[PDB]
């Protein structure tokens with residue numbers, strides 16, 4: 004508790020990095036493996052080397068900035084996130100975890116603290132998945148989720164592959180991607196949701212990450228005149244789609260407290276006010292921390308959709324387009340985060356990460372958990388994404404002590 | 416006198432020729448009001464009318480008046496006409512049949528060298544469908560004094576373009592004042608857009624009434640947030656609200672069977688991202704009934720259900736009724752003239768209430784007016800498979816021809 008971070012220095016680094024790719028709306032547009040992403044990586048690498056770090060890059064472009072330990076070859080305690088952003092990205096998504104880890108190294112240097120295990124800060128390539136799909140591809144390769152050839156062959160809209168662009172910006176590293184043991188892993192991140200702010204809690208002790216299932220549904224009925232078409236004989240595709248929306252809501256509430264169910268996207272055809280809609284495309288978003296429950300939500304959706312379609316007379320195309328496994332983070336790492344919050348007197352609570360992060364894939368090959376701070380209005384993936392300096396400072400203090408606790412564990 | 420008849424083949428071919436302008440792959444027409452395709456159809460009709468000896472004027476709402484001179488130069492005209500614009504999923508007969516049928520009336524009179532006491536006019540009414548700019552029948556509404564010219568010209572499409580702007584763009588911003596000119600009589604020929612005449616094996620529908628309508632625009636405002644990290648108890652989903660109003664609207668219609676009509680045809684979800692709870696949804700409501708009191712009961716149920724749905728979720732509501740006209744009883748003498756024409760030709764006929772709104776519904780307020788119906792295949796309209804046989808098309812034009820001659824040969 005005598006060891007604390009320099010909040011102003013960390014805050015200034017975030018304000019500085021937000022200028023690289025700054026958008027007119029006040030956000031950051033630093034797409035993965037662009038010249039702007041190269042600029043942000045190079046600046047972070049420069050700051051890390053100035054703090055005495057040795058830097059390596061792996062074959063997926065992941066950056067490892069290492070602070071030596073007493074046992075130089077012991078498994079590292081690592082932190083990290085992503086430095087790339089969405090086209091409408093905020094100033095704290097991803098970059099906070101990277102710069103928060105940089106501040107951890109600097110604070111340890113300032114207090115002359117030597118750790119048993121070495122400490123690393125990591126930048127993961129293309130977490131956002133916007134310029135290249137899928138998201139989190141590089142931490143996926145590291146964790147064995149994807150093959151290396153798959154990761155390097157992902158193309159953007161212009162046909163450029165990740166491997167080509169890594170070579171172009173000088174981040175085609177020589178270190179093999181994955182297979183290197185890690186003692187512990189932590190990812191510091193803004194919540195991207197409203198829980199911590201609404202409850203006036205400073206730290207979210209992330210215990211789990213949600214599993215996901217994404218769907219695309221099209222109902223096909225018959226477009227017809229809104230007036231003289233008799234009501235019983237109508238095949239209204241929006242009437243069906245509206246009832247699935249309500250069903251999706253019911254399915255989410257039936258699996259509280261952590262179940263999530265949303266219909267976010269809908270397209271009505273022909274979308275003329277005096278035409279019965281003949282076709283409606285829409286999406287379904289399911290999330291739950293338990294995989295077995297999540298599959299029950301899938302079964303209930305498929306069963307309810309077929310029922311709604313049969314009662315009206317609609318044709319149905321239903322496809323699951325995405326699946327993401329639920330993650331239970333490592334208890335020892337979770338306890339280190341909880342104790343760090345406690346030592347500082349930061350009001351905290353256990354929280355499930357509603358979105359996916361590189362920590363979710365990393366958790367499959369290394370003991371991992373996450374640290375959450377609140378964000379203003381729960382806003383993320385928007386240029387107006389915001390957090391207070393006190394929130395920013397508090398999460399870095401928890402990350403500092405969570406890492407120091409596990410990095411000072413004697414080498415068994 | 417039945418020896419005066421229309422040229423069924425010539426009228427049919429004019430319909431097939433117009434169907435090329437905006438032809439869709441399924442065999443319908445996509446010729447939205449005040450588009451370049453709508454302009455093309457207008458120019459072709461004007462050219463055919465001029466070839467038939469008509470003088471053509473265009474008024475301030477873009478209405479086209481094709482005039483056949485009479486013996487009495489100052490007499491009030493007997494007018495017929497419909498609309499040349501279509502739905503996005505429009506058929507080949509909705510609206511255009513009434514225009515081309517009137518053109519065939521002028522040609523048939525020329526073929527038999529018939530001179531009438533009153534002048535005869537065939538009219539194209541602007542943006543009758545009310546799809547691209549809302550509401551329906553706005554141009555005939557301004558003509559009848561129901562709406563002001565400023566209201567008619569300020570109606571906007573989804574891109575903010577007004578009727579007045581688009582009239583100027585396609586060269587149909589006329590100089591003649593809209594309305595204020597006396598009419599001796601008015602008749603509109605149209606397909607039923609319903610199944611009654613086909614089901615009863617009747618050739619002519621003697622339109623005695625048209626049901627009243629009420630159109631609404633509703634915007635629900637909730638809270639846009641990420642579908643993942645936002646827990647279900649903290650949501651204000653605007654699409655959940657709109658979905659329940661769609662079902663409520665369907666319920667209100669079934670509660671007033673057999674003639675109640677209720678539809679949600681248009682919806683716009685914001686931001687419409689699959690992993691974002693919708694924060695705002697705009698949508699429309701279409702209510703119809705032949706009894707004004709029942710139509711008002713449907714209105715009360717809608718406003719009550721909307722407020723209840725909105726309060727249960729936490730949504731803000733903007734609800735505007737943007738269109739309302741009471742049920743119309745057409746002029747008895749004009750109805751009887753239609754009935755008598757069908758009798759003279761031996762066309763099996765029946766009295767019928769119009770399920771859709773037509774420009775004749777507004778014209779009936781300033782001039783003696785009624786309509787002639789022919790059946791359509793499977794009763795379907797506002798679908799590209801909308802169909803009518805050449806026999807139906809020919810028979811309705813013969814009724815229009817003799818109904819119009821009934822009033823046009825009346826001496827001043």
Ligand SMILES: NC(=O)NCCC(=O)O
Nearest residue numbers: 230277543544551771772
């Ligand atoms: N042409 C036509 O279908 N009528 C438009 C007005 C209405 O929807 O009743």
Ligand SMILES: [Zn+2]
Nearest residue numbers: 096097130360
């Ligand atoms: Zn992130």
Ligand SMILES: [Zn+2]
Nearest residue numbers: 498509510773
């Ligand atoms: Zn029509």
Ligand SMILES: [Zn+2]
Nearest residue numbers: 502509544797
């Ligand atoms: Zn229509």
